[PDB]
Amino acid sequence: GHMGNAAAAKKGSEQESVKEFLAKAKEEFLKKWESPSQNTAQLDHFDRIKTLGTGSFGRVMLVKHKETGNHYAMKILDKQKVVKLKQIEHTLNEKRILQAVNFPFLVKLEFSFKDNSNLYMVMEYVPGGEMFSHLRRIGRFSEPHARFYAAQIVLTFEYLHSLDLIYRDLKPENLLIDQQGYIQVTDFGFAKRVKGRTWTLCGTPEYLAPEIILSKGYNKAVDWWALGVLIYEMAAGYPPFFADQPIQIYEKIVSGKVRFPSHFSSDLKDLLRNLLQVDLTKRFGNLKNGVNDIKNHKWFATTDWIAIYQRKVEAPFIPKFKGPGDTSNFDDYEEEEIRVSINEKCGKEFTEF
Amino acid sequence: TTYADFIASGRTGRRSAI
Ligand SMILES: O=S(=O)(c1cccc2cnccc12)N1CCCNCC1
């Protein structure tokens, strides 16, 4: 067979240890899920420094804690705008997930609180910026470099899926690089507790699984599809399915055809054909052997999964870092006020926050 | 080339959710 006795025993033991870890992690998650933390700081504990990101999702600002001098990334949501955009449940659920999960590649919510006008999530500051920027700058990542990031996503989804959390928002724009060169996943607005199927059309065109496009009930296998898109884009510098307009992208996604750059290794192409599999009965991550079909694939043969988890692997790339508040890996944005009204707004809606 | 096609798509920048 493919493994002799020693290798088979070691792999089996490793896979059983993953099960044991995940069962404990689920126990710990569910305790915090059922009893969420609230109101662990306040606005005047922090100096506002700079806007790190802004969009329909709200704002994220670099802030400095006045007493420790520690920097953080503070997501600010306008309660009235959340209500207007019908994002109450997503906003509450994002914070509830972030305060309950614990994994080395998931951003840590250090504090959260609200005031008359806004909701605030104070997360660790991840100074390296988005993978997206580095990828577009360098062009493409070599296979070992892509593999280092991909392994972190595999482990993170293995963790999330064990908690029955579907992620749904994977793309380079949503992956940050920390000071040690490791990945941080931050955005949980599309994540959902789903043990079975769910139906919402959400995501980003290039990363949508065919079953989402086709208006099917779908499951955590959409995250494994998205991983295939991500690995492809990291290694090629462009995603597998693109076009001028989303509808043309969707036609390519559902077609069952994907083409690869000539520099992709055969191992990489084989993995990608099995992740970018339109047939759900054949997609890696959706079969009887679960995540192990991915983790045991030849393309990952050099990956020491425990060493990645323990953050003991030397990263291929360390972003430039000049100090605790350096923002050079983020874009510049016009700076807007943080208005706090004298009157409480939307109090009932956000009781749980 | 595929790269040139990517540039031509106009979708080389940050991509929003649907
Ligand atoms: O970089 S963020 O502003 C950001 C969010 C959360 C925590 C962060 C921590 N450090 C820097 C930036 C952070 N960002 C907003 C949405 C777009 N995707 C990437 C996350």
Q: Which two tokens stand for residue A165?
A: 């959390």
A313 is in an annotated binding site: no
Of B6, B10, B14, the CB nearest to A238: B6
Task: Compute and round to an integer the Cα radius of gyration of chain B.
Answer: 9
Let me know whether A144 and A264 are in one domain.
yes
Per the structure, the count of domains in chain A is 2
Distance of CA A318 to the CA centre of its chain: 19
Name chain B contacts of A56, Cβ cutoff 8 Å.
Answer: 16
Residue A276 CA to residue A228 CA, distance in Å, equals 6
Concatenated DSSP letters for A62-131?
A: EEEETTT--EEEEEEEEHHHHHHTT-HHHHHHHHHHHHH---TTB--EEEEEE-SSEEEEEEE--TT-BH
Query: Residue A90 maps to which CATH number?
Result: 3.30.200.20
Interfacial B residues in 1-18 facing A (CB < 8 Å): 2-3, 5-6, 8-12, 14-18
In a domain, A200, yes or no: yes
A60 is in an annotated binding site: yes
Name chain B contacts of A235, Cβ cutoff 8 Å.
Answer: none
- Partner B contacted by A215 (CB < 8 A): no
Q: Which two tokens stand for residue A285?
A: 């991550």
Q: Closest-CA residue in chain B for A201?
A: B18
- Nearest CA-CA partner of A88 in A284, A289, A348: A348
Minimal Cα–Cα distance from B17 to chain A, Å? Answer: 4
- Nearest CA-CA partner of A55 in A80, A83, A72, A78: A78
Residue A244 makes CB contacts below 8 A (sequence gap 6+) with: B8, B9, B10, B11
Residue A34 CA to residue A114 CA, distance in Å, equals 20
Do B12 and A244 lie within an 8 Å CB cutoff?
no
How many whole angstroms from A293 Cα to the centroid of ligand 1?
31
Helix (H) or strand (E) holding A184: strand A183-185
Strands A165-166 and A183-185: unpaired
Let me know whether A164 and A224 are in one domain.
yes
Q: State the greatest distance between any 2 C-alpha atoms of chain B, in Å, as a whole number.
A: 28
Residue A346 makes CB contacts below 8 A (sequence gap 6+) with: A79, A80, A82, A83
- Partner B contacted by A199 (CB < 8 A): no
State this model's resolution in angstroms: 1.5
Residue A15 CA to residue A214 CA, distance in Å, equals 34
Let me know whether A232 and A83 are in one domain.
no
Let me know whether A81 and A207 are in one domain.
no
The sign of the dihedral angle between the CA atoms of A297, A302, A307, A312 is negative
In a domain, A151, yes or no: yes
Break sites following residues in chain A (C–N > 2.5 A): none
Ligand 1 contacts CB of residue A76 (under 6 A): no
**Other CB atoms within 10 Å distance of the CB of residue A48:** 15
Helix (H, G, I), strand (E, B), or coil: what is residue A52? Answer: strand
Residue given tokens 């693109």 in the structure block: A242
Q: Which two tokens stand for residue A154?
A: 């595999």
Helices (H), chain A: 5-34, 79-84, 88-100, 131-138, 143-162, 210-213, 221-236, 246-254, 266-275, 292-295, 305-309
- Nearest CA-CA partner of A153 in A80, A113, A118, A103: A103
Q: Which two tokens stand for residue A311?
A: 């953050």
**Other CB atoms within 10 Å distance of the CB of residue A209:** 27
Strand partners, A153: none
Residue A159 CA to residue A314 CA, distance in Å, equals 22
Q: What's the domain range around A24?
A: 18-35+130-320
Concatenated DSSP letters for B1-18?
A: -HHHHHHHHT--S-----
CB under 8 Å, gap of 24 or more: what pairs does A330-339 form?
A: A330/A50, A330/A52, A330/A53, A330/A129, A331/A53, A333/A51, A333/A52, A333/A53, A333/A54, A334/A51, A335/A50, A335/A51, A336/A51, A336/A54, A336/A59, A338/A43, A338/A48, A338/A61, A338/A76, A338/A118, A339/A117
**Other CB atoms within 10 Å distance of the CB of residue A143:** 18
In a domain, A8, yes or no: no
Ligand 1 contacts CB of residue A346 (under 6 A): no
Do B5 and A242 lie within an 8 Å CB cutoff?
yes
